[PDB]
């Protein structure tokens, strides 16, 4: 029932209001954003077409924070680079696949979590084919795998009025009552929210 | 019946006149702002609907200045972090209470209160339940406290022509005669606020 | 009958002319600014309303420069903090008497020359009451005063074409012909005034 | 089918999207832009009207990339300096041929590739003529040549997200999906491409 | 009959054109602005009206450059300051007098030339009294004199296209053909006056 | 009949251009401007009127670049510094004289070439008269002349794309196809001259 206007030091974050919002100054202080998990395959294909299995085989997403593994199939035909990047599209998995050109006629297969957050870091298993698996699969506590971190999962990490927060994105609206702070940057030195009612 | 305007040499600060105010050159140098005393859990609860004590209990909160103390009843029910956070906003106590999920599914409580001033620093004590006295209880002259400070109570502090002042507030009409001086920020070298008859 | 604008290289001065200034470019440096004294109680009182003498008693102030001493007459009744105030103002003794409240509950009374300049340096002396006059007394050659400066008094000095001036007054219509200048503030550097024919 | 919109940290790059792009943060790290061979006569002519050949001959024009080799006829009329740019230009041999008056009364020949890119650069080669072999043959393995390299055939070579990345081209729409990547100037420190979902 | 316009980079200098003045960049260094010669009372009377010769007397004005030296009647009664100021500012001898109240209730006596450069320099003498004569008497060849030199006088000094010009003036409009040259600052480094065809 | 834009990195040079330019980026480093000559006369009259020449006379002027030498007829009545100018100027001879009044009652004259360039630099003799001869002469390779050189004649230097470009104009449109480039400064680091195809 109440309104609130906010204002900040920073283009680093800035924060709007829900009713019943806490009047006057926070001071904000962002360690780290949240990011996805991006993985790229380590190695390259000359094209996005030659299927890469012999057999067909099974893909196994499964992401963190207690969420349910996602099996895939997909046939020997379609272990091309186009054919596991539309069969992972394809099955709202909670990541998302896409191909880079890296030039020099050769391609890496990526795949990105949707939602930033360690909870959203995923293993990639496939069961049934040695080379997809050997050049797909990630497994963290394995040495050897198919796929680079090559965007480390992580936590927005912050302070607001000397508390510290984590969190899985950087759209917050479930740590502070009635607020939702955007983090767009780290921040260097005091800065401060400032929340005025209307 | 005499009008003036004010003119200041920093966003740090700025001023309105009642009539007859007199004009000229305040040399004005602000060392500290007024800060409303935060106190937050040191622990944290994994959620905000659980009891926390097993028997009904009394929160007392007493704030400095000479002003009365609150006792608040909390039923066994009501001692969630939900609870206590309704009992005392209801309670119009001079404080607020509001929770922080700090993130990895933990909850913190947050009491602060509504005004600045080292006079409106506050004692939290729980009679009839160690738990939540523990978890809860907050005095300055104790070893062991349920809170900590995380926004400490303070003073503004400021010198003008000067005379050093010290004030409860960042909006000091009570300082200066006719004078309204607002308080944004702590100031460096000379700064001055011009106040000419209109 | 001819008419001039004016020029200025820095905001640390301006000025406009009457007619027949002579045009030109003008060498200012300005060391010093004129200030009024400000005299204020180095104790304080724990409210306005209590008298602080226990006999009626005569405050006199005597300004410099030649001015008649004023001599004004505070009933023990008025002896208070506000009695004083307003019977200083009251009296327009050239001076401008003010309560300051610089927090924890005390008082301090401040007077005010109403004009800028050494020649306007005040002593206050209260006849009949001890009290009052360890209060509020102000003599520069006595070792113990009941006031302290908390502004000093001062003439503004400033050199044009390399000549040295001294003036009262930060608002100088009476050391150069024809012209006025204003002192907003002390220079650095070389710094100028230009005036042209119309 | 779904739009999107760019905003970049740097004049460095900027970029357009096709429906269907990733929204996000990319960080991007430009090192090197792509550049298109120049070749430049090491030795000049006083006009560019003499011809430089005593018999009739016949120009080869072969870049990298699996292209095929152009062979250009030039009779000994037409072996001036603008006898030669006008039957390369005619040729559309994927090279332009353009003079210099490098003053003097000297001109120089330039021959550049119309793609950037090291698969474009070229070796030029004249049988049945010494002398213009002698003035303008270009073999990157031969020791002594007729052109330098004024300007060094080059690849744009950036990083996407951690993601190593190779090009012909500073117009990128063939290395990341749905999107184009143009690239101005190599970068310093983190910079940012920006792609929110419309 | 032929049109120019100019430009300058900087603000020290600007130029306006007569007709045929000579397109082209011009290198202009100004190391010296001329000035007008200031003459002040080295001493000071308490008043403007009080006479200060005791006879009647001659005040001769002679300035360089070949002019005609003027010889001004001052009685006893006009010799104070107000007469003296009056006397000289009335003859027309390419001098003016003006009255500086320097505060502490003492005035100076300065006079100007009204032109700016060296041959603009005066010499003042007074015949028939000794105390007029030593209070207001100039001679650079003396030892002993009642003005002192406030302001000396000055040529400008500049170079023009590594032409080296001494000018009496800082409004050159004698020294380069169809050219007026205005200075209004001495200069650093490289700066240039251009002058285009219109 | 194909319309080109250009951009540049600098106001130190610009360009325009005709059709059927080159698109696209180029690197242009300009390390000297070129200079039209000036000549001086080192010693001075006292002014323009007096003849210097007890002879008629022969002015010669000679440029460079294979230019025909002209001769000019200056009577006895006319060898005055106006008579001399007069003469020159009316000559159209490629060489544009001038007066300068230094000050101190001193003229000097001045001769310039109308265009820039090593090549416009200009030796002049005057036979049958030893006084102008000396006054006025200049050659280059003789040890005593009349003349001093207060501008060097010299020639534009730059690289376009690591091509070192010379030319006797700031206005060079002769050195590169279709482009026209204006040299108004000497660049520092990484210059560019964009063109892009409309």
């Known amino acids: 029932l109440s309104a609130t206007s906010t204002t900040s030091s920073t283009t680093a974050f800035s924060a709007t209001t829900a009713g019943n919002a806490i009047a006057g100054k926070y001071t904000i202080s962002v360690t780290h954003l949240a990011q996805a998990q991006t993985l790229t395959t380590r190695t390259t294909r000359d094209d996005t077409k030659?299927?890469?299995?012999?057999?067909?085989?099974?893909?196994?997403?499964?992401?963190?924070?207690?969420?349910?593994p996602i099996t895939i199939d997909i046939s020997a035909a379609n272990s091309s680079l186009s054919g596991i990047r539309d069969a992972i599209n394809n099955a709202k998995a909670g990541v998302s696949a896409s191909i880079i050109n890296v030039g020099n006629g050769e391609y890496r297969l990526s795949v990105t979590s949707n939602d930033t957050g360690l909870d959203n870091a995923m293993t990639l298993s496939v069961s049934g084919d040695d080379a997809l698996q050997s050049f797909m699969g990630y497994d963290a506590s394995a040495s050897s795998n198919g796929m680079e971190v090559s965007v480390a999962a992580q936590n927005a990490q912050?302070?607001?009025?000397?508390?510290?927060?984590?969190?899985?994105?950087?759209?917050?609206?479930?740590?502070?009552?009635?607020?939702?702070?955007?983090?767009?940057?780290?921040?260097?030195?005091?800065?401060?929210?400032?929340?005025?009612?209307?």
Chains 1, 2, 3, 4, 5, 6 share one sequence.
């Open 158 to 198: 912050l302070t607001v009025n000397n508390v510290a927060i984590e969190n899985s994105s950087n759209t917050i609206s479930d740590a502070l009552e009635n607020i939702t702070l955007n983090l767009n940057d780290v921040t260097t030195g005091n800065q401060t929210l400032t929340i005025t009612q209307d």
């Open 50 to 68: 030659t299927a890469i299995a012999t057999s067909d085989s099974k893909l196994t997403i499964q992401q963190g924070g207690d969420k349910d």
